[PDB]
Amino acid sequence: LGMMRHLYVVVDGSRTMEDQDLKPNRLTCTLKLLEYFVEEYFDQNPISQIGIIVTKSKRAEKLTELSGNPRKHITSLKKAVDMTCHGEPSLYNSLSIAMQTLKHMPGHTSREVLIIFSSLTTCDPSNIYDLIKTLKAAKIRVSVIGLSAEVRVCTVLARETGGTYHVILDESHYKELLTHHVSPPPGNTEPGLTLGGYFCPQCRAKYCELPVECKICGLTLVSAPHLARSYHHLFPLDAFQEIRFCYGCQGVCAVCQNVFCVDCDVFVHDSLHCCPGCIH
Amino acid sequence: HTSRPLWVAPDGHIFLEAFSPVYKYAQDFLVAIAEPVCRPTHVHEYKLTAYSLYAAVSVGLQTSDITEYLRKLSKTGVPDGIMQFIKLCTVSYGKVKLVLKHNRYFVESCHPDVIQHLLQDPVIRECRLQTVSFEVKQEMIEELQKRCIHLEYPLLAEYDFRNDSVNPDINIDLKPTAVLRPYQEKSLRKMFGNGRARSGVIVLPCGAGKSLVGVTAACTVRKRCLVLGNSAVSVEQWKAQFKMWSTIDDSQICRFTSDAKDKPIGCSVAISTYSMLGHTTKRSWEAERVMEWLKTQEWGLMILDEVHTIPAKMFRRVLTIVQAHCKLGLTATLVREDDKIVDLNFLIGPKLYEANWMELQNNGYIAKVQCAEVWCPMSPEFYREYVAIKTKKRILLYTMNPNKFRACQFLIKFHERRNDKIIVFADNVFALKEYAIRLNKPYIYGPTSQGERMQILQNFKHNPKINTIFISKVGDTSFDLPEANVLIQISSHGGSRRQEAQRLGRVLRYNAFFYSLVSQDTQEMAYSTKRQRFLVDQGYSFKVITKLAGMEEEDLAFSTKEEQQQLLQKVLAAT
Amino acid sequence: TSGTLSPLDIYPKILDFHPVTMATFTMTLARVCLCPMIIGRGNDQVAISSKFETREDIAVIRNYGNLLLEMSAVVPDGIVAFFTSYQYMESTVASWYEQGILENIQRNKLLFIETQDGAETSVALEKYQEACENGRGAILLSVARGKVSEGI
DNA sequence: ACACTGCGAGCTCGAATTC
DNA sequence: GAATTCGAGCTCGCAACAATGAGCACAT
Ligand SMILES: [Zn+2]
Ligand SMILES: [Zn+2]
Ligand SMILES: [Zn+2]
Q1: What whole-number distance in Å separates Cα of residue A185 and Cα of residue C114?
Q2: Paired residues of A206 in beta bridges
């Protein structure tokens, strides 16, 4: 159904992140919903990635490198609550850092940047309008979530590169905007299945209980039940025609010709996702 | 037998079961027949009355549509003391009609045999001067409407607005920007039943569409409306709700509140107040030439906001000064002391629609309120003087209780740390000062101004620093109090169950929850159960918080007894 | 016909004629497309007006600088600040700079003074419309009886 | 041959209760 | 039945009001 994704998350670190109108720290309410966002992203998208960049004082510093590590992100967002966040941000320096790595990904994916942006001013030493011709050439998809106002760049950066621009009503709207950024838009990788506890077959390296890639030999290690939930969307079961003694619960299929009741009929298509007669 | 979820009592009382499969087709039947008395979550209880059946036959159901569908939803069999009552109060509806035509009031009957019966009563012969008609005086239209109910030939005020050809049909049109919720569509359907407007009373909560129904009814009759209100603040809201949802220019929406006077002679919608149309003293000259214009033009759809103040002595003379065809009344709290709400059934008409206050909470149109009657014990120094005196000085004693001062200061601190907008409603204005200066909080004392009343209220909404506010008897109407989240009500008026349904109107405009501070073992304990008597009949549940969640651990005022001895000497020095 | 005939009964009094309609109109909107406000007294309850005696004192020049600072942090992409004259624009901007107020406005937005000569003005206007289109945003502080107030 | 707009007095109500 | 407490709106007297800057399109 969906495709692979390499999402970057640009987090604003300006003077305006000390603002109110949110949970105690405007910065803190951003990092609170981002930890919720990393969990739901990696759950619905199994083999994708997340980078997190934080822009501060006319410069961009990479908080976490681009890797599919659903633990290293949340353990780094907990550290960044005590950030200083002084100075005016940048947007040329942050989208270029998100372009030196995201350009060299293979073309079968959906490379994306997501900017969470509270300041109004991007003091950056060059012209932004040549990036939007470069990012459109490299098939990146930059989408901005704005705070408290609408900036002209963030409209023309979104609608030319291909993303969306959205401004916050409140915190119930800010969770609604981040929830819409987990569904993937409609190749052959080589991952290593990590049987035996959690060890790597290619380099035989033992490490932690994780769906993460292997550092010693560079292989990605996924768990096959986590891949298994994405099945049954492709070739799902066709419904039955319905016109006592049952076959499911023992108290009509067009394939195996075994009747069902009503509780069983709703249960087969909702949770079981297979016909109990057809497995025989 | 397991179906048919009613129990028609032999006097008259209808116990509807709100867990039945046919409940939704039996709750959309009993609204059109009976009036609700109590509505808990399981078994509702309606009630048949005389006025509730006049609203039934005014809609297209006749006397054989009601008395047959009661048998098919009975569970008992109708007890033959209701077949004699339904037949009596439905065949005597459309016989005597009160219609006006070009500034003259006429009592009309199609059957001449009841006019020969009507013209022997000695009080209807005082209000004088096929198709039999006789002209009645305008200034004795209230004493006429009592008598037609007194002999069971009630008057109907069904404005037939589709074709009258006398009134200047104005261009009020409801724009497609305001879509109305499915309870507002049901109230207007019961009003404009047969394609003719009907004079009734619609009871909707203030957080619900109490004003959108009034605008939509004005765009429906499309005649010269006239909106009334209880205050000069309430008409600057009614002016704003007409520009928001009805596409009217500012050369037609006028006002009559002694400060603006936007050329009130010759308009289409006039938004005035009570006690301006019924001001019984020598009026000013600008108001005299408007009242000479307003006393001689037949309106259509007078909109009487805050209906529960109409049966007063001065506010019911408005309905004889102004001549209107149909009279809609919009309110939120229909209950009122002194037993004059049954008197309102002939000043305006039958009660049309009451919103189910729990159905609007389960669908999201109203905030889920967690009522909590936290009561505080009495201090042993204050109860020493409470039982020694009886003559009104003990009202200060159960108001300025030091142990009630701690529960106000604790509940303010407990919700300032959750970023909640706190409103402390507090009457008895001596204790408004002594509560709001010991916590350094703003207070709308009531004789403050018009100026700093408007900026203290605006520093409360668009500022995340000022968090509490101490109102005093001002917010007992439909004012612009800006969407509070808690409401720590302290020591209000005596048994006003109208008040604690207007204090509740601030909260629903758990999500939000309001308290009620009571000094226990005093006279306020008997009062605070008289005022929940209306709210438990709507579904609300009042918990009791005997001891708060860790009150003694923070830095609360009046810790020692030395600082408590000084407060009693401040209270007892008033006398 | 114009857009801002302010009282309609003045123009037939000055110009000796008698109209037959003398009408006014208002535009319809799908939102509130404008939010007019009258920011009166200062943040410490000091009057803000530009009289002739209330111009030298620094309790008003600070309250103009404290306003343009706190509006340049919440308004995106362009603020036009019309002053009453040119000798009041000089004597306020050069009295914001000696205090610590013009330092904090240049952190948010660039500021482009509209001068009297047309060569510098068209330079400062083309950079203003460039600064509103890229990230930073700008402040075109000008004069109300000026060239930019009627043409642009 | 002086004088605009806010703002407090009386005046008369209402709501609910004491007296 | 006749007060009170605290709110309301409507009139209406009362005291005193204010007003500082700078330049190009159009006829022989
Ligand atoms: Zn490996
Ligand atoms: Zn099968
Ligand atoms: Zn079965």
Answers
A1: 49
A2: A199
Q: How many CA atoms lie within 13 A of B460 on its CB side?
A: 25
Query: Which residues make beta-bridge pairs with A12?
Result: A55
Give the single-character DSSP code of A268: I
Instruction: Give the three-class secondary structure for A4.
Output: coil
- Cα separation, A249 vs A104, in Å, equals 54
Nucleotide in closest CA–C1' contact with B317: D13
Distance of CA B41 to the CA centre of its chain: 23
Chain C hits for A128, CB-CB cut-off 8 Å, are: 134-135
d(CA C107, CA B222): 56
Count how many residues are written for chain B. 575
**What is the DSSP track for B283-342?**
--HHHHHHHHHHTTS-BS-EEEESGGGTTSTTTSSHHHHS-BS-EEEEES----TTS-SS
Q: Do B249 and C30 touch (CB under 8 A)?
A: no
- What resolution, expressed in A, was reported for this entry? 3.5
Please count the residues of chain A.
Answer: 280
Tokens 């298509």 locate to A269
Give the C-alpha separation, C59 to C62, whole Å.
Answer: 6
Query: Measured in whole angstroms, how far is the alpha carbon of residue C133 from the centre of its chain?
Result: 20
Classify A265 as helix, strand or coil. helix
* SS percent in chain A: helix, strand, coil, step 5: 30, 15, 55
Interface test with C, best of B173, B244, B249 (most C CBs within 10 A): B249
- Kind and range of the H or E element at B235? helix B234-245
DSSP 3-state assignment of A164?
coil
Taking the CA atoms of residue B543, residue B545, residue B549 and residue B553 in that order, the dihedral angle to the nearest 10 degrees is 160
Nearest to B74 by CA among B142, B14, B164: B14
Provide the token pair at B35: 């009036």
Nearest residue on chain B to C27, alpha-carbon basis:
B249
Q: Are B217 and B188 in contact (CB under 8 A)?
A: yes
Distance (Å, rounded) from C-alpha A2 to C-alpha A108?
11
3-state secondary structure labels for all residues of B297-312: CCECCEEEECHHHCCC
Is the separation of the CB atoms in B161 and B199 below 8 Å?
no
Kind of pairing between the strands at B372-376 and C79-83? unpaired
C-alpha span between A248 and A269 (Å, rounded): 13
Inter-residue contact B37 to B45 (CB < 8 Å): yes
Token readout for A43 is 């759950």
Q: CA–CA separation, B113 vs B109, rounded Å?
A: 9
SS3 C124: helix
Handedness of CA A115, A121, A126, A132 (dihedral sign): positive
Please report where in the chains the tokens 């681009």 appear, as a residue. Answer: A66
Angle value at C-alpha B515, between B514 and B517, nearest 5 degrees: 155
CB contact under 8 A, C109 and A91: no
Q: What single-letter amino acid sits at C60?
A: V
Cα–Cα distance for residue pair A140/A103, rounded to 1 Å: 8
- Structural tokens at position A204: 């035989």
Q: Which ligand is nearest to the CA of A252?
A: 2
- What single-letter amino acid sits at B195? G
Contact B502, B476 (CB under 8 A): yes
Three-state SS across B432-492? HHHHHCCCCCCEECCCCCCHHHHHHCHHHHCCCCCCCCEECCCCCCCCCCCCCCEEEEECC
CA distances from B394 to A142, B427, B527 (A): 69, 15, 14
Q: State which approach was used to obtain the coordinates.
A: cryo-EM
Please name the residues in contact with B58: beta carbons below 8 A apart, sequence gap of 6 or more.
Answer: B93, B156, B158, B193, B198, B350
Tell how strand B327-331 and strand B302-305 pair up: parallel
Structure-token pair, residue B513: 């929850």
- Dihedral angle of Cα B476, B479, B480, B486, to the nearest 10 degrees: 20
B207 is in an annotated binding site: yes
